[PDB]
């Protein structure tokens, strides 16, 4: 359709995980998880990732247990009906800020913060689109005005996002010590969201190399064996002794 | 067995249902005596060159025309729904 109603084509970058023999950047993964928890845990829900997933990837088991033991969950019936809260376990999912979709709609005007579990894989561009959307907030050009409750963002379809600028300068304190600019933080969040979309990337890319190597060797052997066996037919000689009456 | 089957055009070994042949001598060697990978590259290269020079345009013309109209259609459709296209 019209360029205004379809958005601006995303920019292209290079990520460590886009190569043929490269995994993730786990330090960036941990920093992105920290930024997620300290920023977008307030409204965006990630109710498809458990605390046990982060064990051995971004956190140790003791760290995961200690961090999860601070969230209060709701458990099954007591000895006489009732429902009693729990200090949290290592087998629960991350807490959703809202109890249902209608509460989310009521809180944020009329919008609905989408779940972030599988958003990177479900958008036309993935990491590039998400990063450009995060870093692409600019003042509107002359002639186009934004009504109250909307923001100008060229990368969004229609150039009308319902969000506000989520990542300002120095919003989080990184444990490693890197400065928290709007560029570094967005990159780390994009990396963490991509990991949350496909947590199985490393094992898949590790198996594929050996599979491809063995299959290539087998094909190279087959191409020779066929030529070996099909030899006495491709090199026949036919002579015609004319049958004189 | 029997069962008096129908009529076909294949038969089996021994009676393949073909015309009678006469005076057709045929020689062949053993796979263990001949040499694979002998003259493969030369013959394959010559055959590929001849096939490219012979068939060639038969595939070249329709695909080229289709690609040209594809590119033109994409360009024109992008232009028309832009600002200056609608005017």
């Amino acid at each position: 359709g019209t360029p205004k109603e379809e958005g601006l084509h995303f920019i292209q970058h290079d990520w460590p995980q886009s190569k043929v023999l490269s995994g993730f950047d786990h330090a960036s993964l941990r920093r992105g998880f920290q930024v997620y928890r300290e920023v977008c845990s307030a409204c965006h829900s990630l109710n498809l990732i458990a605390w046990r997933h982060l064990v051995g990837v971004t956190h140790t088991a003791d760290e995961a247990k200690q961090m999860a033991s601070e969230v209060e969950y709701e458990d099954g019936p007591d000895d006489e009906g009732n429902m009693f809260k729990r200090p949290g376990k290592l087998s629960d999912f991350l807490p959703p800020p809202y109890p249902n979709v209608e509460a989310a709609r009521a809180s944020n005007n009329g919008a609905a913060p989408p779940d972030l579990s599988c958003v990177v894989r479900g958008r036309h561009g993935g990491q590039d689109y998400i990063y450009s959307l995060l870093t692409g907030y600019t003042e509107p050009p002359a002639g186009v005005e934004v009504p109250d409750g909307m923001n100008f963002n060229p990368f969004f379809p229609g150039t009308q996002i319902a969000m506000a600028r989520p990542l300002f300068d120095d919003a989080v304190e990184f444990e490693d010590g890197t400065p928290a600019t709007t560029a570094q933080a967005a990159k780390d969040v994009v990396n963490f969201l991509h990991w949350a979309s496909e947590p199985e990337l490393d094992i898949r890319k590790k198996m594929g190399f050996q599979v491809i190597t063995v299959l290539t060797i087998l094909t190279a052997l087959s191409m020779w064996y066929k030529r070996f066996k099909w030899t006495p037919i491709k090199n026949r000689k036919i002579f015609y002794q004319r049958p004189i009456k | 067995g029997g069962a008096a089957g129908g009529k076909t055009y294949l038969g089996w070994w021994g009676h393949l249902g073909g015309p009678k042949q006469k005076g057709i001598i045929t020689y062949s060697l053993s796979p263990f005596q001949q040499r694979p990978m002998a003259g493969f590259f030369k013959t394959s290269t010559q055959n590929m060159f001849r096939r490219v020079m012979t068939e060639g345009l038969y595939v070249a013309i329709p695909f080229g025309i289709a690609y040209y109209i594809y590119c033109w259609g994409k360009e024109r459709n992008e232009f028309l729904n832009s600002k200056h296209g609608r005017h």
């Binding site: 090199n235 002579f239 | 040499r35």
Partner: peptide
């Protein structure tokens, strides 16, 4: 009847 075709190329 002809002579044996030369198979020395493939041998």
């Amino acid at each position: 009847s002809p002579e044996m075709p030369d198979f020395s190329e493939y041998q």
